[PDB]
Amino acid sequence: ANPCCSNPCQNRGECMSTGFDQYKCDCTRTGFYGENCTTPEFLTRIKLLLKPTPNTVHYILTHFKGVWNIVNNIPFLRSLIMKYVLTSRSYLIDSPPTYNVHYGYKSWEAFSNLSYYTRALPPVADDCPTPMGVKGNKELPDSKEVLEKVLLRREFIPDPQGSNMMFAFFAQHFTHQFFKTDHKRGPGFTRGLGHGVDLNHIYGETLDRQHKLRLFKDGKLKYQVIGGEVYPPTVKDTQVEMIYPPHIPENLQFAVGQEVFGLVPGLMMYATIWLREHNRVCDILKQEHPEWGDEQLFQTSRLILIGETIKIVIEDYVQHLSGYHFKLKFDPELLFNQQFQYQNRIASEFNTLYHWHPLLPDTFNIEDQEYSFKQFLYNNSILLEHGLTQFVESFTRQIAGRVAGGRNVPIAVQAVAKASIDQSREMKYQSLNEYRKRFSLKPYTSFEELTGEKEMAAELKALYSDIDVMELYPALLVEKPRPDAIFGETMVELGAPFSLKGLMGNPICSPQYWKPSTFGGEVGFKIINTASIQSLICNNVKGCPFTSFNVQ
């Protein structure tokens, strides 16, 4: 019924109904004119004839190891390249945000209501005949049939990039501060009104929760000592709301910023590490400022751990995922002479493609034990039995699973993957190829080009019939990976602009914030600029055990 259901406007042109049966494409600043914005301009012709494909941009960055070794040892050449990485990626995001799950058109309700996730692409209209628009059958294939045929794990497929459980649990700990779906409203609503990296999973979403977690002395957070080790406090001691099964004793009901981090001891591991780091920074600032009160010590510490988070994510977490020989660099000054919006709204699609459940192994191997999912979930006495030291040493050695390549979602969490399929349809996601076009990628012409193989492509083609009807989420998990990589092209090219806008879009990277006095002088400024996952564990885990995001 809606004349824009076929998604006619190309090259990011906006569609608007002009009557019951007619439409018009607004091609403003798209580089193209014509009915559906497909006729390029002469300057656009030159750029399209010169812009290299992302797979070529992935080859030079992962080859010529000796040439990148020269560039890395030159600050000028490294900064000029890192600046190009920042700007080229960040141009793809709409900031301020536009659409959400309920508005396929711009409106003030969509912009102002921070409870919605935002949308890179507008949702399909209710009165469209097919789920994707006009293409495909009236009903998408059975989500359980897609789940069992191409998603579920037969034999465990390890990640060829060496990603370990330290990386996987870091990915789960980090992303679950801005991925906090409000299941009371719907899959398109969020509870992290910060919409970014505010470390609410450490300090609390609301002020009242924060004050319950604070000691109100030297800016530190409340803690307890079990067996000589610093662990988060209990629910009984702080009276914060946590999510635990009714069979969990009171001394094991740990209280952390995120109310669900008692789900798995992997999240509680990082929650304990970051808690210790906060109090460690409180001791440093108090050493440098005996005149500061409790509130300033807490606040300045919080800002320092935020900078440490963004520093570790870019230079370690993203560095490992990229597989680049070029050393990425967290430097906000690279954007001061550029056009960049220091804001961010968390996108629903970013939430979808971050369901990296294939990372999870069949068993969690700690020291000389192999816990199943039943034994590991909601059992933090495991953490107390082994300690952070052996926890780090065990997760550093155990390798995680490959995300792309298909058929690697462990069956323990199969209902989550099936829900990621079902909820994507509930929120009226557009097709995979529509999101590939939205991010300047060539649309797949067949299921075999997508998967890079024949068997899964045959099962998909029997289910979806036409490639233009393939859904985004299952395509990500079964996409052909880059050579010996963990992700395909769609995962990287769509997630990098979201990931970059959420890290650099933080206010601490803005010129008025990025200065030593914001972090208590040059001593606190050095804490951020020398942060690393290795130094985070070495400063807060006994014995200073070697850790990394890759297996040795």
Add this chain to the structure above:
Amino acid sequence: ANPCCSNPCQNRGECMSTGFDQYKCDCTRTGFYGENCTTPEFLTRIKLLLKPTPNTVHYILTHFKGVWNIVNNIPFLRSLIMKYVLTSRSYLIDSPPTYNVHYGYKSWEAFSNLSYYTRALPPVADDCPTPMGVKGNKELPDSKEVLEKVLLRREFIPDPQGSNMMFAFFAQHFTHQFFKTDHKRGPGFTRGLGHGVDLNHIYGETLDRQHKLRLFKDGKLKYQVIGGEVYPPTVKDTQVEMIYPPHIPENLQFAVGQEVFGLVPGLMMYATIWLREHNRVCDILKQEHPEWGDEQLFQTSRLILIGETIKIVIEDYVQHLSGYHFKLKFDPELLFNQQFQYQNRIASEFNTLYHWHPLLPDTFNIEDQEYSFKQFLYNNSILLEHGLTQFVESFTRQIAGRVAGGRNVPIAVQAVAKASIDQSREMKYQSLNEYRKRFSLKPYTSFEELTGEKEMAAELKALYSDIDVMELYPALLVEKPRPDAIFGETMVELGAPFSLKGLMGNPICSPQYWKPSTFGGEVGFKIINTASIQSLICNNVKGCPFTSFNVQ
């Protein structure tokens, strides 16, 4: 005891305590270096030797009328000059925001908690020996003594720029959407979470209030027809809460977006005009999009009226009180190639200096009646008595009062002007000269330099002793005005950046919003780009009465 109470750092360098009695200035990206950021760099010595004073630029813009008559008709030259106006004023506001009433240091609470007003200057620390820091007596002079000696109006002083009551009530109506102090929390807390021009004074702050005001047919707002004229609906049949005295009849309680607009018929006049304009735009959009539903007609009408508001404010409202011969232009495209944060946070000082009560006369002369403050306030029966047309014609003729120059605050609202003094000290405002240095203005060396005369200056000399202790709010109302103007240098050079960042920092001025499809096509786009106070009255007030912001 705080070593930063003397505000030692100059040129926006940030002070930080480095001990119980030692401080350090952070001169990062200030153009200066040294202990208190006072030694200029080479590029700083060149800019300080080439930048003209604000009064010089005001002279050039208010003189050479024939030259501006040529520039106004050269579209490239006019856009070029308006570009310089927008960029030079933008550089002064901290965006993302920094301090508030409770945080003199940058903190995540200060940035995230949207209930606060932000602060262009940090508050004075509570442990400083004097209210202003280290200068003046232990207590500031009697606010009643200041109010009665330099503020209370003995004889009405008309505005030399000819501002009428159409302007005075437009200022009151427009600003009272982002100036809504939360008196349940404190003067530094706002109830306007949009922090800008979201037209919540028409549609409501919360979604539940908006639905009470909406008719849910053709996107129109509810209304009633009294005597053949369109007026807002009553609280009796809408249940939306309004502030009315307990004696007001049920059918005289008009229900509009802002709960306090029943305070004066002047506010209810503009609320009625804008209500009509929304339903008129709805008729225009439905005429062009007969396939749209209620929600999209409403949401698009809202975005259009927001655009109309920013248009009228820049090209009529700001055009009137600037006194410029250069015709101001509202054109978001002038910032697409410029560094500009498309976000805004309402500053508390912007609220402080927008207290333009000297505009009010001693009586409100409508047609042939002269109503006192007692008769005018909370008397919507006056509006139904005379009608909108007579209201527009009467207020166009009645001249408002001069805001600067001293002694023009009407005695009927003396309780307000004292509160502005008290609440400013309660919020620990810094001195007048400290705020002048904050906005690149020369500090006043004497009270006579501030007032431009002898009498009021000698009174302020005997109250404050030192000029560096003079407060911001009373200085704005007693400052020497510009020649035959309404405001002084401080009122203009401090308020213009706040006003700029609030108008152009709106999301609809961002590139992904400034296009026809956002506003329902080229017809709705034309409603924004050809809006004016004259067309607003002509399209919505019966008879198309002549109106203006200046008396004829």
